[PDB]
Write a protein that binds this ligand. Structure first.
Ligand code: HEC
Length: 106
């Protein structure tokens, strides 16, 4: 799907994690964020449409997602350890990554 769709998926699932009823719901949401994040990483955002694929900007753009996926995976580990609250806390920390990217490229 396109960048926008992927972003909506991330935002939607993040709020799901915050509402987190059970471990299952947090894991499902995190898993969907993982896929959406990796999918988004392959797109070319509007602000960089005129830039080369190998440009420093694009690599920086792609880097933002490497960080997000790492954080998501770490939250996944916590969730699969049965530590649901810590995993939700970790999901909250993710926001810093979202905001950083939006500042430069949104
Ligand atoms: C860069 C590496 C990004 C990371 C990490 C995240 N987002 Fe993002 N987001 C990015 C761009 C360039 C844009 C503009 C997309 C466009 O062309 O319209 C966005 C936009 C959003 C939006 C609003 C627009 C929409 O999705 O329709 C939301 C709701 C959004 N992003 C949420 C979001 C969340 C929750 C993230 C972290 C968990 C996140 N984004 C990361 C680039 C990047």
């Amino acid at each position: 799907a396109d960048l926008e769709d992927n972003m909506e998926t991330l935002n939607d699932n993040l709020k799901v994690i915050e509402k987190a009823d059970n471990a299952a719901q947090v894991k499902d949401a995190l898993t969907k964020m993982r896929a959406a994040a990796l999918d988004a990483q392959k797109a070319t955002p509007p602000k960089l449409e005129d830039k080369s694929p190998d440009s420093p900007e694009m690599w920086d753009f792609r880097h933002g997602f490497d960080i997000l996926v790492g954080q998501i995976d770490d939250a996944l580990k916590l969730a699969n350890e049965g530590k649901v609250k810590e995993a939700q806390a970790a999901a909250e920390q993710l926001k810093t990554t979202c905001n950083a990217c939006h500042q430069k490229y949104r």
